[PDB]
Design a protein around this ligand. Structure first.
Ligand SMILES: [Mg+2]
Ligand SMILES: [Mg+2]
Ligand SMILES: [Mg+2]
Ligand SMILES: [Mg+2]
Ligand SMILES: [Mg+2]
Ligand SMILES: [Mg+2]
Ligand SMILES: [Mg+2]
Ligand SMILES: [Mg+2]
Ligand SMILES: [Mg+2]
Ligand SMILES: [Mg+2]
Ligand SMILES: [Mg+2]
Ligand SMILES: [Mg+2]
Ligand SMILES: [Mg+2]
Ligand SMILES: [Mg+2]
Ligand SMILES: [Mg+2]
Ligand SMILES: [Mg+2]
Ligand SMILES: [Mg+2]
Ligand SMILES: [Mg+2]
Ligand SMILES: [Mg+2]
Ligand SMILES: [Mg+2]
Ligand SMILES: [Mg+2]
Ligand SMILES: [Mg+2]
Ligand SMILES: [Mg+2]
Ligand SMILES: [Mg+2]
Ligand SMILES: [Mg+2]
Ligand SMILES: [Mg+2]
Ligand SMILES: [Mg+2]
Ligand SMILES: [Mg+2]
Ligand SMILES: [Mg+2]
Ligand SMILES: [Mg+2]
Ligand SMILES: [Mg+2]
Ligand SMILES: [Mg+2]
Ligand SMILES: [Mg+2]
Ligand SMILES: [Mg+2]
Ligand SMILES: [Mg+2]
Ligand SMILES: [Mg+2]
Ligand SMILES: [Mg+2]
Ligand SMILES: [Mg+2]
Ligand SMILES: [Mg+2]
Ligand SMILES: [Mg+2]
Ligand SMILES: [Mg+2]
Ligand SMILES: [Mg+2]
Ligand SMILES: [Mg+2]
Ligand SMILES: [Mg+2]
Ligand SMILES: [Mg+2]
Ligand SMILES: [Mg+2]
Ligand SMILES: [Mg+2]
Ligand SMILES: [Mg+2]
Ligand SMILES: [Mg+2]
Ligand SMILES: [Mg+2]
Ligand SMILES: [Mg+2]
Ligand SMILES: [Mg+2]
Ligand SMILES: [Mg+2]
Ligand SMILES: [Mg+2]
Ligand SMILES: [Mg+2]
Ligand SMILES: [Mg+2]
Ligand SMILES: [Mg+2]
Ligand SMILES: [Mg+2]
Ligand SMILES: [Mg+2]
Ligand SMILES: [Mg+2]
Ligand SMILES: [Mg+2]
Ligand SMILES: [Mg+2]
Ligand SMILES: [Mg+2]
Ligand SMILES: [Mg+2]
Ligand SMILES: [Mg+2]
Ligand SMILES: [Mg+2]
Ligand SMILES: [Mg+2]
Ligand SMILES: [Mg+2]
Ligand SMILES: [Mg+2]
Ligand SMILES: [Mg+2]
Ligand SMILES: [Mg+2]
Ligand SMILES: [Mg+2]
Ligand SMILES: [Mg+2]
Ligand SMILES: [Mg+2]
Ligand SMILES: [Mg+2]
Ligand SMILES: [Mg+2]
Ligand SMILES: [Mg+2]
Ligand SMILES: [Mg+2]
Ligand SMILES: [Mg+2]
Ligand SMILES: [Mg+2]
Ligand SMILES: [Mg+2]
Ligand SMILES: [Mg+2]
Ligand SMILES: [Mg+2]
Ligand SMILES: [Mg+2]
Ligand SMILES: [Mg+2]
Ligand SMILES: [Mg+2]
Ligand SMILES: [Mg+2]
Ligand SMILES: [Mg+2]
Ligand SMILES: [Mg+2]
Ligand SMILES: [Mg+2]
Ligand SMILES: [Mg+2]
Ligand SMILES: [Mg+2]
Ligand SMILES: [Mg+2]
Lengths: 46, 270
RNA sequence: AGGACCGAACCGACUAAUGUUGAAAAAUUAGCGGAUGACUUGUGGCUGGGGGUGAAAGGCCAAUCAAACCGGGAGAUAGCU
RNA sequence: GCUCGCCGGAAGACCAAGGGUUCCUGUCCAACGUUAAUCGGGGCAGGGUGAGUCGACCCCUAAGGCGAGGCCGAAAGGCGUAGUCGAUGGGAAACAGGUUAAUAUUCCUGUACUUGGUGUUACUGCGAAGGGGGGACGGAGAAGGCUAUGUUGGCCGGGCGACGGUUGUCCCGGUUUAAGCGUGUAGGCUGGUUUUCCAGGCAAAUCCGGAAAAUCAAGGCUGAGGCGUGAUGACGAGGCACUACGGUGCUGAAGCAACAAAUGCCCUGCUUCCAGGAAAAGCCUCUAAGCAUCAGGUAACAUCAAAUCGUACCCCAAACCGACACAGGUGGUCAGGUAGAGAAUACCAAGGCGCUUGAGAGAACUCGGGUGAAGGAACUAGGCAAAAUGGUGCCGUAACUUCGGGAGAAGGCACGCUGAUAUGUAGGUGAGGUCCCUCGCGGAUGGAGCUGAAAUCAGUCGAAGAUACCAGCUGGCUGCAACUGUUUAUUAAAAACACAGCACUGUGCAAACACGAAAGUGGACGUAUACGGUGUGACGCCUGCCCGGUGCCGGAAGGUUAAU
RNA sequence: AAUUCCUUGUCGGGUAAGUUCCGACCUGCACGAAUGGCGUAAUGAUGGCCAGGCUGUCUCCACCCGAGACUCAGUGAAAUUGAACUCGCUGUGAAGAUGCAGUGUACCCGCGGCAAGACGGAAAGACCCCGUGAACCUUUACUAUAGCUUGACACUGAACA
RNA sequence: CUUUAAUGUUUGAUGUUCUAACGUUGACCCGUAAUCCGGGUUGCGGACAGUGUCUGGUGGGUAGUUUGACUGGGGCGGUC
RNA sequence: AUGGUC
RNA sequence: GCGUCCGUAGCUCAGUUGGUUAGAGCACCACCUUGACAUGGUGGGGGUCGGUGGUUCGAGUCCACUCGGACGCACCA
């Protein structure tokens, strides 16, 4: 079939990337809710 | 202007409109630009006026709804199929090399010498403002504020007829049958607009919608009642007064409230 | 010339037999429909939960739909087992 | 190692996606592998990814994102001008041979080609933020000219056959050579050239634009492939000295001709259709600003550049998406034979695999299949399933009709091989031979040679000649819907929805109307022959009565009447 | 008739026979003119019916070749399950017995099958009821709202008549 | 006081000419390489229109809830 | 405006 | 099978309009007209307003139920 995950790096870095988390002020709180619980995979940039 | 011969279901009902006066070639190059298909969605990215989207690549042709150059005569060169509007567009060469696009009147060909301005002689093709036109002669490209651009009466085959020149105002009769006051010094153009049989064109099939960019239209009593008032029924039922999607009555209810323009509307269209 | 015909790629999925802790949480084998058009397809961008999109079945929106997914009020309330 | 089998438009040969040592070389079999297991895509360790030319950045953009100021929202913020990014598209350059256990257009071999400055000698007009030309652009269609490509000849070398025959019109291989560089053919486009003047291109223009006169009759562009050079080089039958069964070094004949032919190329060209087919830059031209001969551009030589980054490997699967080493899915590139209309089909070569459990016996029963005496739908809800028809050519073909259709209506007739017509014809191609010559890649007369249908007539084998594989069951009355389409991904594809057409009605433009508290945007850079809403659903014949309820439209003298 | 209940209405073809089909009648329970009437060439993976061709669909099933199922070798699951030394009957009885009461047959234990029972086993039943339980939906159910428009006041000015 | 109508005024309505408040999704010049915006020059409209406050009407566009029990099982009848 | 039937 | 309009002359009628008192069209013909039939007229009987009660002297009439026809049915698989 045509399954759910169809992978693309140039879409993933623009959707769930760090510079995607950049401009949205409601996303700065998301980064500040991952740093302040201390995860290793902060965002899915590589 | 012939019916197409019934070879197969799909050309059984086609009446074309063909015209051999046109240009079988490429448009004039420095007059194009880009008119991309906006797809019926605004900056918020939502469908606001429905049914639109699809079609063919419509390259805009710039066209001069002002005709500002007084005095200088202007020979016509050829005619072309501007795919934006339902008229045809003449290509005009002035006496000093400037080319332009204008609307095509009814009696136009290759060889006419039109002239724009105040002191133009009276013949179809010419333009001149409406305190020198004589009363009764039917005009197109009528402007509502002096110098804006041709705004009234600009379709395939329309006209407006000047009936009275009193004071510092003129009174028209528009193509939708409503009289109208206009400032006595707006820039109108004599004679009608050429391609007078667009209404004879039956398109023929479904495909001539979605080669023109009109999507399907689902009538009201198809839907389920969260999408339109007319829905429901275990079968067919239309037991409610006929409405829009958004609540309002549609079979007659007037919707004009632009009360800053009612100085000029002399009588409504009946 | 064709929203033409018979027909492989390609797209779709009408009937029957397999199989329903199977090779697959929707497929396989013999047959089927369209197949220069209102088509099919790779890339990118746009729309957003009472809102989006709909050639209209309440369909579909991350294997979830007559109101999605996650966290919070919330240890919601329960004459009922 | 050698018998057998399977795909050969795939399960063969590669890349962009995505994964991230899965790649090669030693060593190990405890878990992993659906079995055994010395083997591995498994465990450990070591090696392996070489660029001026090929891909990313890079100059310029399309959708669209952000957006100094700016406008508008309670703050968050929402849009949006100047600008700034965004590939999926435009922009300079390299082809062949050889080597590694595992990389090559990247290293080596002869040969290239472009883009930058700098420095010389010669002549003088250069300029960017604007101007102009150009980049620059659909769908369908037929021909013509070719090529990759294949076949039979020409030649070179080897073979005389496990049993009948095989010194020959006999058997097998081999016949390959690129980029670049002068030439301007098939074929396509445009008439050139000299001069006066102009309100136009945001100011100037000596190029584009537009009036005007003199002439000159072909000037310029475009461009597939052979043709000359590249190239006395490389490759190549091999004979073959070592020789571990690892391979190594010298050597090395032919290297021509015809015929056929693409979906590739001339082709960004031609004809024609209505639904009328992008941008800015690189590339050229043009000027007033100004530098007044220092800069600055244009020719041969010489110099060095040309940095960084990514290149292994799988990439229709065992490495990606599907929890499985999953009968699932995923976009592009190449296209051999004998039949064949053909990328269908049947067997094949180049190439790859026998799908990680087996050895047996020959029960009921079940899955997948081949055959069948008499009858031939009596089966059942129902001809469900199965069987059957099935191609090319010719004669022929009903009611009904919107003149097209119905129609491949229905039914029939010939078909294998051999010989002759013709020792291979009609046709296609085309070498010599000769003539002028406006000259070159010539133009004609010319017919060698090659290739090769289709038909008629005799003759012959079988039970049967479209023999296998592919390859329509036909006809008779109705119900619904005009039709082609589309949806309930994952139990309903239908009579449901759509549609061309008709009709009401709203809207004169800062339109109605929708997404938005608001700026603004769609509507459209559209203007009533246009747009939105509702309803019916081609076309033919038609669309009648009822304004009392209930909507809606028009009236404003009268009674009831809010805030104030 | 896709609408017709009394109904297989009534007649005629089709069949030996025809509750469906085609053609007429009208006593239409309750068609009907743009939520459209009737009609129609072509078309439909469409609804209904008869005919020729064809045969395992069938009367009536027989044989054959292959992948399983049976045996031996290696790897090796899952649903369930209070416990178990787990027979038939007539009767009793949460009222439809392997056990209770009476009676009669039966040496203990495996593989190959058939599927009647153990109210067999996955799903705290969807059907109706109960819930002063909720979601969506409709309206001339109630109560308020966005939007629409009505007048007063401000931004709001002078003369005028 | 029945109840008029002439000098002056006390205050809201009905209409018209003007413009300085506001309007301009009308042209021209500047910031400017700029159609957004802002500055002035003008033309047209103008005491309207547009907007804030209260009030009348309309308002399933949108929202929250209600709709009883008894009953030889419920709805329908009765009954309270 | 009155004037059907035999 | 809530409840309604309701229930009458040889045919449909009106009359409950919060109560008392009897109203028609059509039409059976004897007679007035026309040569002759009606189109016109006098006329006589024809309603305890289905039935049983009560408020009531005065009710066809203000009503609770019974036979008959139309006017609304939802729930239920
Ligand atoms: Mg529309
Ligand atoms: Mg329509
Ligand atoms: Mg529709
Ligand atoms: Mg529906
Ligand atoms: Mg609604
Ligand atoms: Mg109905
Ligand atoms: Mg109805
Ligand atoms: Mg589909
Ligand atoms: Mg289906
Ligand atoms: Mg299949
Ligand atoms: Mg086809
Ligand atoms: Mg087709
Ligand atoms: Mg929600
Ligand atoms: Mg889903
Ligand atoms: Mg909800
Ligand atoms: Mg709480
Ligand atoms: Mg709880
Ligand atoms: Mg609680
Ligand atoms: Mg094979
Ligand atoms: Mg094939
Ligand atoms: Mg490994
Ligand atoms: Mg190894
Ligand atoms: Mg193992
Ligand atoms: Mg082992
Ligand atoms: Mg390996
Ligand atoms: Mg390994
Ligand atoms: Mg190098
Ligand atoms: Mg490159
Ligand atoms: Mg953009
Ligand atoms: Mg912005
Ligand atoms: Mg800002
Ligand atoms: Mg850029
Ligand atoms: Mg790209
Ligand atoms: Mg690219
Ligand atoms: Mg330029
Ligand atoms: Mg083309
Ligand atoms: Mg060749
Ligand atoms: Mg070749
Ligand atoms: Mg031999
Ligand atoms: Mg021999
Ligand atoms: Mg040979
Ligand atoms: Mg070359
Ligand atoms: Mg490599
Ligand atoms: Mg390799
Ligand atoms: Mg592959
Ligand atoms: Mg796979
Ligand atoms: Mg799975
Ligand atoms: Mg395997
Ligand atoms: Mg296997
Ligand atoms: Mg076996
Ligand atoms: Mg057997
Ligand atoms: Mg058989
Ligand atoms: Mg038989
Ligand atoms: Mg036989
Ligand atoms: Mg039968
Ligand atoms: Mg069948
Ligand atoms: Mg078959
Ligand atoms: Mg259909
Ligand atoms: Mg679709
Ligand atoms: Mg389905
Ligand atoms: Mg706009
Ligand atoms: Mg319809
Ligand atoms: Mg219809
Ligand atoms: Mg009507
Ligand atoms: Mg009326
Ligand atoms: Mg009315
Ligand atoms: Mg009114
Ligand atoms: Mg029927
Ligand atoms: Mg009926
Ligand atoms: Mg019936
Ligand atoms: Mg009968
Ligand atoms: Mg009938
Ligand atoms: Mg109907
Ligand atoms: Mg109607
Ligand atoms: Mg179809
Ligand atoms: Mg029968
Ligand atoms: Mg098997
Ligand atoms: Mg077994
Ligand atoms: Mg075993
Ligand atoms: Mg026991
Ligand atoms: Mg018992
Ligand atoms: Mg028992
Ligand atoms: Mg059982
Ligand atoms: Mg069993
Ligand atoms: Mg049971
Ligand atoms: Mg049970
Ligand atoms: Mg329960
Ligand atoms: Mg509600
Ligand atoms: Mg109850
Ligand atoms: Mg009951
Ligand atoms: Mg009385
Ligand atoms: Mg008489
Ligand atoms: Mg039912």
């Amino acid at each position: 079939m045509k399954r759910t995950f169809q992978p693309s790096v140039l879409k993933r870095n623009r959707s769930h990337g760090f510079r995607a988390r950049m401009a949205t002020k409601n996303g700065r709180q998301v980064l500040a809710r991952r740093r302040a619980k201390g995860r290793a995979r902060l965002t899915v940039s590589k | 202007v012939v019916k197409c011969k019934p070879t197969s279901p799909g050309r059984r009902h086609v009446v074309k409109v063909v015209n051999p006066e046109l240009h079988k070639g490429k448009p004039f190059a420095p007059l194009l630009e880009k008119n991309s298909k906006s797809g019926g969605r605004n900056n918020n990215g939502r469908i606001t006026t429905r049914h639109i989207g699809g079609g063919h690549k419509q390259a805009y042709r710039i066209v001069d709804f002002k005709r500002n150059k007084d005095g200088i005569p202007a020979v016509v060169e050829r005619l072309e199929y501007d795919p934006n509007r339902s008229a045809n567009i003449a290509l005009v060469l002035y006496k000093d090399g400037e080319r332009r696009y204008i609307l095509a009147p009814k009696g136009l060909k290759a060889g006419d010498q039109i002239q724009s301005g105040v002191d133009a002689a009276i013949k179809p093709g010419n333009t001149l403002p409406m305190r020198n036109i004589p009363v009764g002669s039917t005009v197109h490209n009528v402007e509502m504020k002096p110098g804006k651009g041709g705004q009234l009466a600009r379709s395939a085959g329309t006209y407006v007829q000047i009936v009275a020149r009193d004071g510092a105002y003129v009174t028209l009769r528009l193509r939708s049958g409503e009289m109208r006051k206009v400032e006595a010094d707006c820039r109108a153009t004599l004679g009608e607009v050429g391609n007078a049989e667009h209404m004879l064109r039956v398109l023929g099939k479904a495909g001539a919608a979605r080669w023109r960019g009109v999507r399907p239209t689902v009538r009201g009593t198809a839907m389920n009642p969260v999408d339109h008032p007319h829905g429901g029924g275990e079968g067919r039922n239309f037991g409610k007064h006929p409405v829009t999607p958004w609540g309002v009555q549609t079979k007659g209810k007037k919707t004009r409230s632009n009360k800053r323009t009612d100085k000029f509307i002399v009588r409504r269209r009946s």
